[PDB]
Amino acid sequence: SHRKFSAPRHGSLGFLPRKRSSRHRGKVKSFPKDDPSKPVHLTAFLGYKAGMTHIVREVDRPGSKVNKKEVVEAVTIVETPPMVVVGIVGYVETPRGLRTFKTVFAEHISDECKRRFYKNWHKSKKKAFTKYCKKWQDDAGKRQLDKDFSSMKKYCQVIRVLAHTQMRLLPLRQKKAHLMEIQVNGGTVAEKLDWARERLEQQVPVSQVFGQDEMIDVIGVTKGKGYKGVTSRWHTKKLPRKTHRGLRKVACIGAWHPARVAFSVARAGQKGYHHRTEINKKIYKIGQGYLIKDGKLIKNNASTDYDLSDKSINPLGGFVHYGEVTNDFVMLKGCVVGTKKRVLT
């Protein structure tokens, strides 16, 4: 027979390969589209989730009951040190897809970027890029690399840039820096590649990528929770107390003739550690790190034009399970995906 009382589905059918994430760093699946009218710029950045706090601000939309009032807001601090550009990569449009064409790394690659190429930095002999760095101070090697740049300028349609984080200025335990392709969207391919060549072996701060009061996207891996039950996983109804084999289970899977258990039937398994992209998070403030002109400047982080104190965004005793933020940061309205010390795009 049919179902007596109609009910919506527990769980989403779009999010159900619920496997543990094969990647740890939040990967961009879709960069914004480019048009040759705006100047060249980065479209993504990579920072680490520090913590959470309040924000008291002035509400300025008409028509609401909360017009010209004060609210509190749950925000995320994301410590975003300026990254280092150590390479570029070109892409060509094929009828089978969007294929990479040529990857040109930089001459002087830092040891934090070199840690990524090794699974064991201790037992390694640190021999990466040793015959590739010799292709810069000679005439024939620089000529072949310039011919490769010219071939990329002629044939490539999509240009991404290779940038890695700085693990020296962070309170985390690890030293292996995260590398990332960031698609440069802007003018023509020649001016784009010339700007990327200019920004090679350089620092990219946050203000060159994002600005004030911008609605951005957060990409990251969920805080892992382990092999959870179907009640904790799919939020199904608990069976009553009088059950014999269990009350935190799914009672009926399905019918006899085929409704053998499908992708749509809720089961127990992995909860958490899932790749997630959540859109429309507002940047309240892009902070400024600790800089020295005579002594330390701790004021410019958390002192507003209404507070006029000498506070930084570091709490009393620092951030819980993260460390102490000494670098420039961003502060996003809402909550972002991932636990503390989590890499976040």
Binding site: E93, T94, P95, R96, G97, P258, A259, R260, V261, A262, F263
Partner: protein, 199 residues
């Protein structure tokens, strides 16, 4: 030893039967430019046919079930696979022999390609009937790369126009050379036309 067939203007099943038979007869066939394949019956008929094919899917695990390929080359591969005995070793060898391409790749753009008049639209359909392009069908089902293939085909049509201009220049040199030499190959040209050449 390899046929290079053009998919321009050729009917889907009419071409697929001939390709299936010639590949089962032990011959390497490369069917190319398969978004130019046209199917008899108009676009709403062919679109609802392929949408019904999309609706046919396995209920319990659609990743286990029918694989619905959107690209026109893989649609042609599917309609030859439905004619080949693909559950057998000779059918799998025939599927290994057949190579199908969207657009036309640089391994095959500089090759003379063949035309099958037994599977062609001008020969087989009445001119008052309707048809539908497999490229438009695939693009409005969900195949992504009609425009990239269009720009690449525009580039190679410019390159082939340059090559055909050079071929016309070589051919006018050949004709003016025959005009210069036809006084000294007088008994070389005559012994071809007494046996059936150049007339």
């Amino acid at each position: 030893q390899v046929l290079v067939l053009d998919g321009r203007g050729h009917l889907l099943g009419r071409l697929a039967a001939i390709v299936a038979k010639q590949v089962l007869l032990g011959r390497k066939v490369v069917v190319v430019r398969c978004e130019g394949i046209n199917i008899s019956g108009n676009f709403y008929r062919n679109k609802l046919k392929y949408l019904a094919f999309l609706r046919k899917r396995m209920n319990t695990n659609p990743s286990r079930g029918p694989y619905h390929f959107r690209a026109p080359s893989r649609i042609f591969w599917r309609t030859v696979r439905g004619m080949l005995p693909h559950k057998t070793k000779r059918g799998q060898a025939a599927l290994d022999r057949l190579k199908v391409f969207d657009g036309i790749p640089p391994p095959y753009d500089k090759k003379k390609r063949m035309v099958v008049p037994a599977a062609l639209k001008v020969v087989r359909l009445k001119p008052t009937r309707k048809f539908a392009y497999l490229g438009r069908l695939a693009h409005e089902v969900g195949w992504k790369y009609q425009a990239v293939t269009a720009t690449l085909e525009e580039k190679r049509k410019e390159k082939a126009k340059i090559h055909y201009r050079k071929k016309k220049q070589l051919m006018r040199l050949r004709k003016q050379a025959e005009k210069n030499v036809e006084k000294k190959i007088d008994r070389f040209t005559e012994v071809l036309k007494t046996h059936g050449f150049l007339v």
